[PDB]
mmCIF file with all atom_site columns, C-alpha atoms in Angstrom:
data_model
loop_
_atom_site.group_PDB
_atom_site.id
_atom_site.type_symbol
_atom_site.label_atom_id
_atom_site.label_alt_id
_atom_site.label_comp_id
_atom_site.label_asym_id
_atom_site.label_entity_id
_atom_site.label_seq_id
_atom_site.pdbx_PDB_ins_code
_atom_site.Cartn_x
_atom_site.Cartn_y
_atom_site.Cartn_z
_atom_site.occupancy
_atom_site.B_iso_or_equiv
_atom_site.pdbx_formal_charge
_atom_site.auth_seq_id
_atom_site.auth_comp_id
_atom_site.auth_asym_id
_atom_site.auth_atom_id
_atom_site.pdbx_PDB_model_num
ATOM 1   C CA . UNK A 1 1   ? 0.000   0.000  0.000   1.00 13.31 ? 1   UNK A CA 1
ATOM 2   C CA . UNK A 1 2   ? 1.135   3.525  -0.775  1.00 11.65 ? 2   UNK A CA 1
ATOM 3   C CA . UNK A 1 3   ? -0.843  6.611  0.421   1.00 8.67  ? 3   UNK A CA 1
ATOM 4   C CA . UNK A 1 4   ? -0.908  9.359  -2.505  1.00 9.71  ? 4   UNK A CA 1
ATOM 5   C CA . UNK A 1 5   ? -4.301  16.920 -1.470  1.00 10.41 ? 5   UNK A CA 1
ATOM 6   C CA . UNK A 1 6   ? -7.974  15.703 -1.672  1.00 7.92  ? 6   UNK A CA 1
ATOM 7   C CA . UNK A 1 7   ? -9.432  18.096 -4.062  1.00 9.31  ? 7   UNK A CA 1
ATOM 8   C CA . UNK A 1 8   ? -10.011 16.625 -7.562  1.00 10.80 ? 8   UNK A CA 1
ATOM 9   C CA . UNK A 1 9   ? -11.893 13.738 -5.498  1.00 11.19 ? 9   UNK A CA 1
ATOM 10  C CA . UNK A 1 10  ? -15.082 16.459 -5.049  1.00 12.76 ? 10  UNK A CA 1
ATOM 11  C CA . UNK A 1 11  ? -14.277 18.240 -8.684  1.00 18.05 ? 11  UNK A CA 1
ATOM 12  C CA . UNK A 1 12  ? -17.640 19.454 -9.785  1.00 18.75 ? 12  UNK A CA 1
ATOM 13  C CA . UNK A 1 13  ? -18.181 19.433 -13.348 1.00 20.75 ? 13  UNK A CA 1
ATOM 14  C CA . UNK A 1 14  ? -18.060 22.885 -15.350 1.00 19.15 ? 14  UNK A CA 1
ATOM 15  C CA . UNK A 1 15  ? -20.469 21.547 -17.620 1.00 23.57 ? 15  UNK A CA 1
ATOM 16  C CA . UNK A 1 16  ? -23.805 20.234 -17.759 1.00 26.97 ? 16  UNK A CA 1
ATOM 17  C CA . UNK A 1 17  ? -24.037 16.222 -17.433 1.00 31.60 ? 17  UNK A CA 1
ATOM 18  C CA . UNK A 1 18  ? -23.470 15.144 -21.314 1.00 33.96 ? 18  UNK A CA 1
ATOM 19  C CA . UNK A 1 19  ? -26.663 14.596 -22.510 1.00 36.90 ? 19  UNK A CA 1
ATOM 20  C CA . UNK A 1 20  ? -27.484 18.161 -22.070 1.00 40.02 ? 20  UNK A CA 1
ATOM 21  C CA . UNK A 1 21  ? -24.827 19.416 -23.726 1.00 39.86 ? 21  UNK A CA 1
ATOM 22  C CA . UNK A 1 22  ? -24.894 21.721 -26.940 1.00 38.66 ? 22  UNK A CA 1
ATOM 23  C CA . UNK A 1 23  ? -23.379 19.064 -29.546 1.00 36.46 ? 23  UNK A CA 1
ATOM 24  C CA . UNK A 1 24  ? -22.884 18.332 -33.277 1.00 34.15 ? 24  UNK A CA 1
ATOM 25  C CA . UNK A 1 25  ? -21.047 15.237 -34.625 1.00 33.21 ? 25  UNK A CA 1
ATOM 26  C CA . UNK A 1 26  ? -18.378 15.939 -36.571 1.00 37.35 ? 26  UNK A CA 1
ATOM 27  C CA . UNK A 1 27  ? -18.011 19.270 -35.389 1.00 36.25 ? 27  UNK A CA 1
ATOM 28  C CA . UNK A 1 28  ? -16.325 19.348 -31.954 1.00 38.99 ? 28  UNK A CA 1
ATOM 29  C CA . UNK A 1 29  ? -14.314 23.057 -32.486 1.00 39.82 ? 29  UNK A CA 1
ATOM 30  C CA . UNK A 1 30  ? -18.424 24.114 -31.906 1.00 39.62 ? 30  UNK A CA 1
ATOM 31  C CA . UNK A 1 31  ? -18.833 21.659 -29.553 1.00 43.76 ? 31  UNK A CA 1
ATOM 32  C CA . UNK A 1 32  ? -16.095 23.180 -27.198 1.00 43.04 ? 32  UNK A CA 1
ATOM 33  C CA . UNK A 1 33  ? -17.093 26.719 -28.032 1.00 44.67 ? 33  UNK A CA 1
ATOM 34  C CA . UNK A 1 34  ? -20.579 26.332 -26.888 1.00 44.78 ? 34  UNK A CA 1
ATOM 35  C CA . UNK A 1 35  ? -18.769 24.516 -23.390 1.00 43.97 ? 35  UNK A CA 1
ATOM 36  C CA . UNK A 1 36  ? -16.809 27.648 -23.339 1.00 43.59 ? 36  UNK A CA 1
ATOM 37  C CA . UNK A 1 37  ? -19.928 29.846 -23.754 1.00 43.17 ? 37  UNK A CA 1
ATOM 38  C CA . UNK A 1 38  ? -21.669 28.060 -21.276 1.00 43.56 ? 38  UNK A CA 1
ATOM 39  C CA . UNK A 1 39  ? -19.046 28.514 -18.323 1.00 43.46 ? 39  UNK A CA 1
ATOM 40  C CA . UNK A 1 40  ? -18.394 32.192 -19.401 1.00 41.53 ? 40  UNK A CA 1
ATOM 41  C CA . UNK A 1 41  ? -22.002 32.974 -18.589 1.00 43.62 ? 41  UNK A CA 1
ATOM 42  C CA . UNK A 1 42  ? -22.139 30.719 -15.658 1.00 41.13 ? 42  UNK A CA 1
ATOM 43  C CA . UNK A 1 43  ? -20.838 31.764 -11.971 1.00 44.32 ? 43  UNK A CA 1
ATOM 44  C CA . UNK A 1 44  ? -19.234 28.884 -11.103 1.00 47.02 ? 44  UNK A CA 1
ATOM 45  C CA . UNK A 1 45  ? -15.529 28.707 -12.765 1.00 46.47 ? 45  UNK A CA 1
ATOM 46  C CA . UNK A 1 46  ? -13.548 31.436 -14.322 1.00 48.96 ? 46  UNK A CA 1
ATOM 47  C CA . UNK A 1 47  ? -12.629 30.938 -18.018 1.00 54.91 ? 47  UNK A CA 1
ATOM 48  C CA . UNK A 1 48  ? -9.327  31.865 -17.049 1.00 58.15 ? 48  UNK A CA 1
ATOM 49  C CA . UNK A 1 49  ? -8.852  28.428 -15.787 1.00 59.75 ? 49  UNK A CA 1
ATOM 50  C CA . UNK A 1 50  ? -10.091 26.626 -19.210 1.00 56.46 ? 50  UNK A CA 1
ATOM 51  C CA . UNK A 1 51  ? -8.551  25.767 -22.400 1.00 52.46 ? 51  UNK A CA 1
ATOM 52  C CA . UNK A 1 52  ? -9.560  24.555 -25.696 1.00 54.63 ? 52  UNK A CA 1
ATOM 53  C CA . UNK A 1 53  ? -7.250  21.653 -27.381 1.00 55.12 ? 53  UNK A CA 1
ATOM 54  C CA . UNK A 1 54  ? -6.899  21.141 -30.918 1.00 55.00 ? 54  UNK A CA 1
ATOM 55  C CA . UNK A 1 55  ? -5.768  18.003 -31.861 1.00 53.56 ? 55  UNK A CA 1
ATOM 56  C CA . UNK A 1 56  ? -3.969  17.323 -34.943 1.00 53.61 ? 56  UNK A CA 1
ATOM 57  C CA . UNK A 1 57  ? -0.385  16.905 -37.345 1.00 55.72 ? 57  UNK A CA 1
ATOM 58  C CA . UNK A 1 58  ? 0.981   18.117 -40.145 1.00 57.60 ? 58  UNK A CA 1
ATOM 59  C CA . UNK A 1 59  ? -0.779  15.129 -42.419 1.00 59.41 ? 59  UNK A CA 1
ATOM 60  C CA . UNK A 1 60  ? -3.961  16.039 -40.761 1.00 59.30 ? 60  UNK A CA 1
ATOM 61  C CA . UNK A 1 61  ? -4.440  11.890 -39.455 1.00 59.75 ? 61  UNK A CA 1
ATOM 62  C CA . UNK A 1 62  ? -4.669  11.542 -35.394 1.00 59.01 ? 62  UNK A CA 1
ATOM 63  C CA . UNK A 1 63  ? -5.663  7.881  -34.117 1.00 59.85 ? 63  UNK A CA 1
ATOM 64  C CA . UNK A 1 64  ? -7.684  8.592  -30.730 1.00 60.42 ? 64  UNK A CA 1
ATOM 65  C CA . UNK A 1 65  ? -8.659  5.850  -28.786 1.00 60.63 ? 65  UNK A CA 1
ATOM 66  C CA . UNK A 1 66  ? -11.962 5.077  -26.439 1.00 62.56 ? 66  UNK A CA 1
ATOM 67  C CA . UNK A 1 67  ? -14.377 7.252  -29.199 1.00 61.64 ? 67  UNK A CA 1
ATOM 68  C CA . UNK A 1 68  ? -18.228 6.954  -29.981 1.00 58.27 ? 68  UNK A CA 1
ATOM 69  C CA . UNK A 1 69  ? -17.716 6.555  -33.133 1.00 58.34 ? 69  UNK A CA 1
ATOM 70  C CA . UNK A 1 70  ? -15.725 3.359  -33.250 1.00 63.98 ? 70  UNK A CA 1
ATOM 71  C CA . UNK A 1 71  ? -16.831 1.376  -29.875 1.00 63.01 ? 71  UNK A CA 1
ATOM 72  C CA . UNK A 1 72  ? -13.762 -0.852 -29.078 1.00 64.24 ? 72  UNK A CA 1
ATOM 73  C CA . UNK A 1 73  ? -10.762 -0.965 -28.752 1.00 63.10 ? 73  UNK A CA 1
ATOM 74  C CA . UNK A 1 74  ? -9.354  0.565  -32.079 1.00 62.23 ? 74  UNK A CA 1
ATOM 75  C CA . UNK A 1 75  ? -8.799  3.890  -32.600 1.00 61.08 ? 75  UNK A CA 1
ATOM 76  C CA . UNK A 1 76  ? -10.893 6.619  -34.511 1.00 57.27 ? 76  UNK A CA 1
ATOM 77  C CA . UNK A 1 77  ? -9.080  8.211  -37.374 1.00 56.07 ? 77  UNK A CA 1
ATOM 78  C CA . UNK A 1 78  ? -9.385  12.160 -37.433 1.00 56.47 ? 78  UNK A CA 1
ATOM 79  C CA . UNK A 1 79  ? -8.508  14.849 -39.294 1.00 57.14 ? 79  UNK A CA 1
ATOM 80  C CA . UNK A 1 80  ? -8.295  16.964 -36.045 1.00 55.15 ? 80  UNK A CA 1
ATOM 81  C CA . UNK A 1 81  ? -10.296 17.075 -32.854 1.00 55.28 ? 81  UNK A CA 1
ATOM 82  C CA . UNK A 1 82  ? -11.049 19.355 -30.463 1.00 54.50 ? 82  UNK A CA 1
ATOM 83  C CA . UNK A 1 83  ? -11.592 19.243 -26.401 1.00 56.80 ? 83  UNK A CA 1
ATOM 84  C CA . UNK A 1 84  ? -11.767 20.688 -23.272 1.00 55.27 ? 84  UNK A CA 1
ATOM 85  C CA . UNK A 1 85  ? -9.413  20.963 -20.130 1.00 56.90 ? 85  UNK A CA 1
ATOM 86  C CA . UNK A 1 86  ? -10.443 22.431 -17.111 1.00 60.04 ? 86  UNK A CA 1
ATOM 87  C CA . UNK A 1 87  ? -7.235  23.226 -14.791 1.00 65.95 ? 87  UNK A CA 1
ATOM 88  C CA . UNK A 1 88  ? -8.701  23.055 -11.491 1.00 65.70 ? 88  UNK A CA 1
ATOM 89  C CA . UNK A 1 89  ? -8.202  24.832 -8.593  1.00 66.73 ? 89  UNK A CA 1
ATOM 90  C CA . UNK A 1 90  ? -6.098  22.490 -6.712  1.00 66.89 ? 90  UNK A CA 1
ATOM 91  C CA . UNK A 1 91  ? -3.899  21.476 -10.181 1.00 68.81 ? 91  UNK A CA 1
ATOM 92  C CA . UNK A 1 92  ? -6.183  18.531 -11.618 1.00 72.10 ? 92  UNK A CA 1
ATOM 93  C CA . UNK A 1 93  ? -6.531  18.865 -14.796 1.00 75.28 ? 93  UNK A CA 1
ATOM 94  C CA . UNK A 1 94  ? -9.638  17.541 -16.490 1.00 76.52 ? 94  UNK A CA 1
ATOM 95  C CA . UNK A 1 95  ? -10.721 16.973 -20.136 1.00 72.92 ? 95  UNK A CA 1
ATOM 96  C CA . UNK A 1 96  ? -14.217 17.887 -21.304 1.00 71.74 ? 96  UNK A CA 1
ATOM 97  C CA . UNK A 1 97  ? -14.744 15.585 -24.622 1.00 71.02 ? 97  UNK A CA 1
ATOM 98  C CA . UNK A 1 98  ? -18.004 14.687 -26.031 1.00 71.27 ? 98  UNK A CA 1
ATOM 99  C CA . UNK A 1 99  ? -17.326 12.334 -28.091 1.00 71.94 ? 99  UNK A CA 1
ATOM 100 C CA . UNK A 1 100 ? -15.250 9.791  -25.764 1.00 71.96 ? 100 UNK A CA 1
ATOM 101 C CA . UNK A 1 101 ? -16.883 6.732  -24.263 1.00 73.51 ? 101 UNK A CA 1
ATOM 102 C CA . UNK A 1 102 ? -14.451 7.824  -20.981 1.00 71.36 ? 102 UNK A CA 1
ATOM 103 C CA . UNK A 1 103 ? -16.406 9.369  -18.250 1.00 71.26 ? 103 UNK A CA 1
ATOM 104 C CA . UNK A 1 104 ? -17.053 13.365 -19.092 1.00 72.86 ? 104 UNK A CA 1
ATOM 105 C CA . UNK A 1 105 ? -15.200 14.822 -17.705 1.00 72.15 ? 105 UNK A CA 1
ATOM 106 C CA . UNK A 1 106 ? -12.446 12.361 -17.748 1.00 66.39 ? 106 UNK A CA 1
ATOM 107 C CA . UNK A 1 107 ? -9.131  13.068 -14.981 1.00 67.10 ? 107 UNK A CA 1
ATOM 108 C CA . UNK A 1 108 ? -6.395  14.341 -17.614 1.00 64.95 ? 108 UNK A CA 1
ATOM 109 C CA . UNK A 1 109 ? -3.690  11.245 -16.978 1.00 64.96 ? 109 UNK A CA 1
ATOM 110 C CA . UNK A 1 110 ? -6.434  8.880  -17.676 1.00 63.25 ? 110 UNK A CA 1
ATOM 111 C CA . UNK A 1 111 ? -7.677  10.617 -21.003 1.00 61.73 ? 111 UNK A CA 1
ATOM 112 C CA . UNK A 1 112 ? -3.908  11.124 -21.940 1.00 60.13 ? 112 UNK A CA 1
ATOM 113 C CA . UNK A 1 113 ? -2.823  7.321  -21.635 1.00 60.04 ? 113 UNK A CA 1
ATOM 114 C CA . UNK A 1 114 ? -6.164  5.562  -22.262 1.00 60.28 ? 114 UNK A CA 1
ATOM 115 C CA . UNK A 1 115 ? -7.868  7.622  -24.921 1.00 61.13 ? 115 UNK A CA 1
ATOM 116 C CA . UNK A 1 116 ? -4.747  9.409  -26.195 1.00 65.61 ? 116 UNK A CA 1
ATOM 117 C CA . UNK A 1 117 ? -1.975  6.508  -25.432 1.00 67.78 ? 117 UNK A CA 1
ATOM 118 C CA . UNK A 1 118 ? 1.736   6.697  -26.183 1.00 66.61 ? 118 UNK A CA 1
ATOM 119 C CA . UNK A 1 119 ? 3.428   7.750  -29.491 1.00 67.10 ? 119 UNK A CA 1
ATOM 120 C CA . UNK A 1 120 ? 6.155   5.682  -28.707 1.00 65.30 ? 120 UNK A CA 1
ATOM 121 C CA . UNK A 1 121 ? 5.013   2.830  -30.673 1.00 65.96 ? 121 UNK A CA 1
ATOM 122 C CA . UNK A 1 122 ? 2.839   4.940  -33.602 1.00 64.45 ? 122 UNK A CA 1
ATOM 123 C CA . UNK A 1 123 ? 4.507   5.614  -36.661 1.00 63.29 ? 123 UNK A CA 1
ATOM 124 C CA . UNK A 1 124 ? 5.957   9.101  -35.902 1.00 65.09 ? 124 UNK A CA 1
ATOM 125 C CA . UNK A 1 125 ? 3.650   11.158 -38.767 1.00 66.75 ? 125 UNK A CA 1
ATOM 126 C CA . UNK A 1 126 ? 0.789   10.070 -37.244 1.00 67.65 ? 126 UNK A CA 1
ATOM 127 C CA . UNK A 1 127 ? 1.803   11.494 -33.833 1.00 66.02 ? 127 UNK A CA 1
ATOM 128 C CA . UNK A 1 128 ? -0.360  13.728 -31.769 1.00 65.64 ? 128 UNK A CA 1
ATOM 129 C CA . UNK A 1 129 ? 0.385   18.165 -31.457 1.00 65.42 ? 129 UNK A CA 1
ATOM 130 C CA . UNK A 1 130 ? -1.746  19.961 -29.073 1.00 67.87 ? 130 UNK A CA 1
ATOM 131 C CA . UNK A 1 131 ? -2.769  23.725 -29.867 1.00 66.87 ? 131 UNK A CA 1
ATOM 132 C CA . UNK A 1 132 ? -3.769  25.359 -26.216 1.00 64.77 ? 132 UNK A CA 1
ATOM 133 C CA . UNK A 1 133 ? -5.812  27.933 -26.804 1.00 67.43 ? 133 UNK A CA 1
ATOM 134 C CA . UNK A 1 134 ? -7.428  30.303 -23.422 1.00 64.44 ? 134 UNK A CA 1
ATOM 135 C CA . UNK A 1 135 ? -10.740 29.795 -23.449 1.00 64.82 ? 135 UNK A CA 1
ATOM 136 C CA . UNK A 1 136 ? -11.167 33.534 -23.803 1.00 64.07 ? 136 UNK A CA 1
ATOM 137 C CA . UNK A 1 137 ? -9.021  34.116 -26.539 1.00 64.26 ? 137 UNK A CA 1
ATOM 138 C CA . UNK A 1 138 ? -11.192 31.364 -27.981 1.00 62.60 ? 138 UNK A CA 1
ATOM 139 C CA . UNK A 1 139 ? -14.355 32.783 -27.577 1.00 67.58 ? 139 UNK A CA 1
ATOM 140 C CA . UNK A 1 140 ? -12.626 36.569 -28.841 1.00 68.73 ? 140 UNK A CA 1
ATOM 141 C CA . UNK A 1 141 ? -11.194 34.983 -31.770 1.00 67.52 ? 141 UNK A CA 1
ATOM 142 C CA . UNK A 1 142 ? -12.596 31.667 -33.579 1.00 65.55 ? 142 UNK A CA 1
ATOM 143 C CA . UNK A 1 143 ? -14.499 31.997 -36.318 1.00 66.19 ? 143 UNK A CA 1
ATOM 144 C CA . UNK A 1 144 ? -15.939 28.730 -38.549 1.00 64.09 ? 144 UNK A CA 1
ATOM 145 C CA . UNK A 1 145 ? -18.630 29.467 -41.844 1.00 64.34 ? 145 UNK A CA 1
ATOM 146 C CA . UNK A 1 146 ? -18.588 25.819 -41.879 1.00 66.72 ? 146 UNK A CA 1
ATOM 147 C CA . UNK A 1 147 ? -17.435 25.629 -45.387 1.00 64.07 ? 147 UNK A CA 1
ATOM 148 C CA . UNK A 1 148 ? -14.963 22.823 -44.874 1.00 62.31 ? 148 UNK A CA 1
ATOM 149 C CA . UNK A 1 149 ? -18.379 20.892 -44.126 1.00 60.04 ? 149 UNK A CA 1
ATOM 150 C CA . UNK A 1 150 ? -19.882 21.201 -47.853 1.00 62.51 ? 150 UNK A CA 1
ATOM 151 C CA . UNK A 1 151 ? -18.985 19.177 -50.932 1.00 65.55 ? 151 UNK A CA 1
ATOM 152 C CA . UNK A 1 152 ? -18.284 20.967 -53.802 1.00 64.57 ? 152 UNK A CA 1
ATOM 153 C CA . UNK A 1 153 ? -22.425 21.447 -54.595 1.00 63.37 ? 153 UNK A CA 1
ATOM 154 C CA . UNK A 1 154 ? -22.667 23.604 -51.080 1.00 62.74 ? 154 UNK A CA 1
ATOM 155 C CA . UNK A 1 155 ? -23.960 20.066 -49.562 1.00 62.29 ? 155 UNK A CA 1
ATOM 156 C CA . UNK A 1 156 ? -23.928 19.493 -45.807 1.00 63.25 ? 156 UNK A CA 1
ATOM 157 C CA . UNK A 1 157 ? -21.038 16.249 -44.806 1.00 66.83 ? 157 UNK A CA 1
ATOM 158 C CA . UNK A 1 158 ? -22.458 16.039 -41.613 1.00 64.82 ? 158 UNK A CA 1
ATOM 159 C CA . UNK A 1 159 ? -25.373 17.935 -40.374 1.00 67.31 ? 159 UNK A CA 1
ATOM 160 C CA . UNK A 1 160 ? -24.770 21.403 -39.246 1.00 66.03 ? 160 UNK A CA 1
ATOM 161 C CA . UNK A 1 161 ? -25.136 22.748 -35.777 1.00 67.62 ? 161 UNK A CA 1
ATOM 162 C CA . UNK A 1 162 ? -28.747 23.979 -34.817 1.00 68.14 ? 162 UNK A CA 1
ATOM 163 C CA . UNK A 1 163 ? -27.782 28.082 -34.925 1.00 67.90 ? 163 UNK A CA 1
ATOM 164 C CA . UNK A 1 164 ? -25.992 30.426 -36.812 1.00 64.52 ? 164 UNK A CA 1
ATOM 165 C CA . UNK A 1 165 ? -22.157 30.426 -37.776 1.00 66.26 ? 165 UNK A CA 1
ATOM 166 C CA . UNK A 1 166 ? -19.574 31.427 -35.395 1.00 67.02 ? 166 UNK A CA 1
ATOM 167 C CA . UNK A 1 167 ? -18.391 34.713 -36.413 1.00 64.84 ? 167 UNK A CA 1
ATOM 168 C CA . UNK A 1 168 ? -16.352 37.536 -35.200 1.00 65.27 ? 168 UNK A CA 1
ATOM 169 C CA . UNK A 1 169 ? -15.491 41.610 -35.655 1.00 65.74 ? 169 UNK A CA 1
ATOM 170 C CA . UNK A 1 170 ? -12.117 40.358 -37.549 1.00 63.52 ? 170 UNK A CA 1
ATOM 171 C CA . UNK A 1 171 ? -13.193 36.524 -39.214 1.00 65.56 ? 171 UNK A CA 1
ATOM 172 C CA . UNK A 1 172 ? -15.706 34.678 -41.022 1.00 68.10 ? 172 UNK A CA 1
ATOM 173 C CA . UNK A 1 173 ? -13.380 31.905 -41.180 1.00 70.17 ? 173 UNK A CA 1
ATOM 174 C CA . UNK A 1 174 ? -10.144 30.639 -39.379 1.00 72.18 ? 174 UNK A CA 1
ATOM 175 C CA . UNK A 1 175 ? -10.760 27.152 -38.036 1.00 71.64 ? 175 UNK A CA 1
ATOM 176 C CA . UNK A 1 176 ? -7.328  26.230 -40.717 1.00 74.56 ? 176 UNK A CA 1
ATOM 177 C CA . UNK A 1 177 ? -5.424  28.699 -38.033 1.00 75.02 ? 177 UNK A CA 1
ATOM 178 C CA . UNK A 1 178 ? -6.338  26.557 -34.960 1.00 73.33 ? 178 UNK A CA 1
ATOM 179 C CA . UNK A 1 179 ? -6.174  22.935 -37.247 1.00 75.13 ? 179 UNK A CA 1
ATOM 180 C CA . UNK A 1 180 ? -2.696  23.828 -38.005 1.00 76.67 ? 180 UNK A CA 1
ATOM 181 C CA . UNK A 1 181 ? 0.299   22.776 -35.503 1.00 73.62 ? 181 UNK A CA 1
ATOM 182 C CA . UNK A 1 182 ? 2.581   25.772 -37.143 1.00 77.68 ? 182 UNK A CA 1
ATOM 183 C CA . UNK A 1 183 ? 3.411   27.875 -34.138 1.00 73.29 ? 183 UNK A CA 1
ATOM 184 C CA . UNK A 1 184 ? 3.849   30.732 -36.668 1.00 71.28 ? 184 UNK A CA 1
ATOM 185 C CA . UNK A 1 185 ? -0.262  30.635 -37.635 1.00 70.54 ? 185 UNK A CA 1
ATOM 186 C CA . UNK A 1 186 ? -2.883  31.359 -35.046 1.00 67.26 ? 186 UNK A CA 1
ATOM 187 C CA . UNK A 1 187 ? -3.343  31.679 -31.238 1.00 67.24 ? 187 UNK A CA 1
ATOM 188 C CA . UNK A 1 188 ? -2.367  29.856 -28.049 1.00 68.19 ? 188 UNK A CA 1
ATOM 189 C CA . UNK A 1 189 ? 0.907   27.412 -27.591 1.00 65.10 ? 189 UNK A CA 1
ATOM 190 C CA . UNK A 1 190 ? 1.445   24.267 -29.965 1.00 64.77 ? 190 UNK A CA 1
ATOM 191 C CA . UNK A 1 191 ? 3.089   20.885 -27.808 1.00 65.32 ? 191 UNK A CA 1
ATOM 192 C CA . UNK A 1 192 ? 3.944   17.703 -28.444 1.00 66.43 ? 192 UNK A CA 1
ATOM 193 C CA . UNK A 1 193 ? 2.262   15.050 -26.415 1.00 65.36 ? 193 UNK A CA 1
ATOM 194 C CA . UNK A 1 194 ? 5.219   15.121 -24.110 1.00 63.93 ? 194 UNK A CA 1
ATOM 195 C CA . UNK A 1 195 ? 5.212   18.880 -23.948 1.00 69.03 ? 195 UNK A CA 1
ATOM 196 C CA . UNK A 1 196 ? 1.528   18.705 -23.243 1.00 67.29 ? 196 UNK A CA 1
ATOM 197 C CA . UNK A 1 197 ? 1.421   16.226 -20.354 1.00 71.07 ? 197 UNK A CA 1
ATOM 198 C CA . UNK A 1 198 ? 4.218   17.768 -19.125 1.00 70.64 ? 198 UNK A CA 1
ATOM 199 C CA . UNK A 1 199 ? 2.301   20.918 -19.110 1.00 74.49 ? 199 UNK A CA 1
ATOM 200 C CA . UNK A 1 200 ? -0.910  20.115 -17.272 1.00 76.42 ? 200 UNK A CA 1
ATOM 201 C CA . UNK A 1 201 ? 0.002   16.375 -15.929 1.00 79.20 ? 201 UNK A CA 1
ATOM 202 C CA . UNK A 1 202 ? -0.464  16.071 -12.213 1.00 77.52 ? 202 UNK A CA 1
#
């Protein structure tokens, strides 16, 4: 026996339980926004303590592991995907995700090596870069017209979110500047995965 403070073990959720969620297959950058939205106007955390994740590499092809979409125990192949982490008061870190069959929200060491898992054995292009984005420079500056959604004839992939686009004073569009792992485009820090646990990891 080993003995390992107490706080993460009463975390409260910053979100409402996941079936009451704002959500959208296929589009998880909205997803998170609308999480963000929700705390903002909320009094019980500070977005100061909140982050979107992009998930993604240069070839645009991230295995993640423990998804809806594939039950299992294979991975999900996307072009980029996007979550939640709460950094708690007491240093927890916990990931909001939507689409993971993990609980929601999911403690971050447990979403990191179960739904995540190690690069050591992927084929290094298919690695996993993190873009950490404030949740308030999120809300201030994402912008998505959906058109990466629509086939060449302006029809819908997937079906679209149930309200208008995201828009801001400066964008229509700039969900390619959050996608991308090029610290030289966009907002927020890029990591590896090592970078990244090391970042938030308890």
């Amino acid at each position: 026996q080993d003995m390992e403070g107490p706080a993460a073990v009463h975390y409260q959720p910053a979100s409402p339980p996941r079936d009451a969620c704002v959500y959208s297959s296929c589009y998880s950058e909205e997803n998170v926004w609308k999480l963000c939205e929700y705390i903002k106007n909320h009094d019980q955390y500070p977005l100061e303590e909140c982050y979107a994740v992009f998930i993604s590499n240069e070839r645009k092809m991230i295995p993640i592991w423990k998804q809806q979409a594939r039950p299992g125990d294979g991975p999900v192949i996307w072009d980029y995907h996007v979550v939640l982490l709460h950094v708690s008061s007491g240093g927890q870190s916990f990931i909001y995700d939507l689409d993971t069959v993990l609980p929601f929200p999911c403690l971050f060491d447990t979403y990191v090596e179960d739904a995540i898992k190690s690069d050591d054995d992927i084929h290094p292009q298919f690695r996993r870069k993190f873009r950490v984005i404030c949740a308030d420079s999120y809300l201030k500056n994402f912008a998505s017209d959906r058109s990466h959604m629509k086939d060449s004839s302006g029809n819908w992939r997937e079906p679209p979110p149930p309200y208008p686009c995201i828009e801001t004073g400066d964008s229509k569009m700039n969900l390619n500047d959050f996608i991308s792992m090029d610290p030289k485009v966009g907002w927020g820090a890029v990591y590896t995965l090592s970078e990244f646990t090391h970042r938030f990891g308890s």
